[PDB]
Structure formats: C-alpha cells, structure tokens
Amino acid sequence: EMEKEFEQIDKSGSWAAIYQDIRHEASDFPSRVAKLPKNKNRNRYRDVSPFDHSRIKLHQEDNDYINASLIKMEEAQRSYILTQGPLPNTVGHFWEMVWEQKSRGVVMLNRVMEKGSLKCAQYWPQKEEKEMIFEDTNLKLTLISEDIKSYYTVRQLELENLTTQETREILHFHYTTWPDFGVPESPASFLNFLFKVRESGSLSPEHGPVVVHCSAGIGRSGTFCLADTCLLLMDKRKDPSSVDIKKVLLEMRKFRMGLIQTADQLRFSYLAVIEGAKFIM
Numbered sequence: 001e002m003e004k005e006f007e008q009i010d011k012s013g014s015w016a017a018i019y020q021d022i023r024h025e026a027s028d029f030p031s032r033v034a035k036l037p038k039n040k041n042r043n044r045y046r047d048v049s050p051f052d053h054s055r056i057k058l059h060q061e062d063n064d065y066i067n068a069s070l071i072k073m074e075e076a077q078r079s080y081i082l083t084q085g086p087l088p089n090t091v092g093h094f095w096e097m098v099w100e101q102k103s104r105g106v107v108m109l110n111r112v113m114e115k116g117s118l119k120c121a122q123y124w125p126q127k128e129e130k131e132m133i134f135e136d137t138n139l140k141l142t143l144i145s146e147d148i149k150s151y152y153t154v155r156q157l158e159l160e161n162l163t164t165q166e167t168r169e170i171l172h173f174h175y176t177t178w179p180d181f182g183v184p185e186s187p188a189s190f191l192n193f194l195f196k197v198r199e200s201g202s203l204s205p206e207h208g209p210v211v212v213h214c215s216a217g218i219g220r221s222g223t224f225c226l227a228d229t230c231l232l233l234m235d236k237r238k239d240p241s242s243v244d245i246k247k248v249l250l251e252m253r254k255f256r257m258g259l260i261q262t263a264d265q266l267r268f269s270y271l272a273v274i275e276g277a278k279f280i281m
C-alpha cells in the first residue's frame with residue numbers, strides 16, 4: 001500500500017532517490033520528426049519532444065507536426081493528448097488538433113504569465129463579442145460563457161469549421177491557482193478540479209481524448225493524468241492496493257518523455273491519489 005510507502009519515503013526523505021530511479025528506468029524512443037529543422041519553430045523547448053510512435057499528426061499535407069503525444073492507458077480505458085502550451089504561431093495548429101481528434105475538453109494547468117514570462121499564447125477569446133479566426137486552419141472560436149471560481153475557471157467555447165460550417169461545443173477547464181514555484185500545499189482544490197472534468201463527460205470514451213497542457217506538457221500535465229488513471233484503476237481492480245503509482249508513471253512515460261518533472265510533483269501525485277482514494281472508498 002502507497003500510504004505506507006508515502007510515510008517510508010517521507011520519514012526517510014528519499015523523494016529525490018525514488019525520482020532518480022524513475023528517471024533511469026524510463027523509456028527512450030526516437031523523436032526524429034520533432035528535431036527536423038522545419039519543425040524548429042513549432043517547439044517551445046528544444047529538450048521536450050514527442051516520440052515518433054505516439055505523436056499526434058495534423059491532417060494537413062504541408063507539415064503534420066505538433067508537439068503533442070497520445071497517452072493510451074489500456075487497462076484504465078483512458079486516453080489523453082498531452083501537449084505544450086501553444087505558441088503564437090501554433091494556436092491554429094492546436095485548434096486543428098482539437099477539431100481532428102474530436103476532443104470535448106481542454107485542460108489548462110498554467111497561467112499565460114508566470115515568473116514574469118509568457119508560458120502560453122492567449123489561444124481563446126476574452127469576450128463573447130470578440131471571436132478569434134485562425135486563417136491558417138480555417139477555424140472560428142467563440143466564447144459562449146465563462147464561470148470564474150476561486151481555484152479554476154470553466155469556459156464554454158464554440159469551435160466552427162469555416163470549410164464545412166460544422167460547430168462543436170468545447171469545454172475549457174482552466175486551473176488558475178497552481179503556484180509559480182513548488183506544488184499546492186493540499187491536493188483538495190486539484191481533486192475538486194479533476195472531479196469537475198470527469199463530471200463534464202470530457203474523459204469519456206464517447207469523445208476523442210481530452211487535451212491536457214501546462215507550459216511543456218510534462219510536469220503539471222503529468223500529475224493530472226497520473227492521478228486520474230491511478231484513481232480509475234483503484235475503482236476497477238479487485239484489490240485497490242495493487243495499484244503502484246511508480247509502475248503507472250513508467251507506463252505513461254512510454255508515450256511522452258519526462259512526465260512529472262520534480263520530486264515535489266511525484267510527492268504531490270502520491271498525496272492526490274492517497275486523498276482521492278478516500279472519496280473513492
């Protein structure tokens with residue numbers, strides 16, 4: 001059981017050591033498409049690349065590349081697209097991916113500005129009456145409504161394919177209170193947020209995979225998927241204590257490098273799953 005393992009690692013202060021064993025055990029696959037010179041301007045960070053085998057392809061004949069990975073968790077029956085916060089030049093690509101993958105939800109775990117730098121382009125409209133048109137990908141995006149709460153905002157968006165005039169409703173789940181440094185002290189508001197995304201239907205197999213991002217699409221984004229998958233496996237298994245968070249993280253790292261960036265994010269993931277297990281038992 002992980003509550004017991006949590007106390008062992010915490011009382012022995014071994015979090016950096018566990019985190020290093022995960023780093024050394026993690027898969028390494030080619031990411032040749034990400035490193036093509038023509039893709040250089042499509043990557044926010046030169047050391048964060050999708051693997052070729054799990055990368056999302058755009059259906060545009062010109063350049064199919066976006067920094068995004070499909071994480072398929074077979075036992076949990078959950079898929080996720082993890083991507084970087086869009087760049088000024090990739091906002092049209094991002095919405096093209098949402099359209100093509102038939103996603104219902106976008107989960108954003110960062111602020112546009114953190115530590116005095118831009119972590120993400122402003123890729124959604126700020127006002128109902130000022131819609132955004134992405135000329136490169138022929139999409140129109142409208143803010144329909146916005147519900148601002150203390151820890152998160154939920155926005156209803158209409159995405160319109162200008163080529164075919166089809167429209168879809170997209171839900172934007174924006175977690176707004178992750179601190180600039182470190183992790184939240186308590187996982188309560190993060191769990192509430194995760195249950196709100198689940199309640200929306202955005203994580204359900206009827207729809208395409210949810211799109212999850214922070215700045216690089218590996219740290220906070222990693223915590224989100226890891227918590228969700230672990231809690232779902234605890235519902236599904238005869239013995240919930242058979243769920244090993246280190247094994248699940250390693251399985252997810254086959255699909256995208258570097259998921260969970262710090263020993264602090266690993267500790268917070270344990271805490272979120274341990275606390276979430278109480279609401280699930």
Ligand SMILES: CN(C)c1ccncc1
Nearest residue numbers: 040041043044087088089
């Ligand atoms: C590659 N990169 C971080 C950028 C590209 C275009 N504008 C801003 C940043």
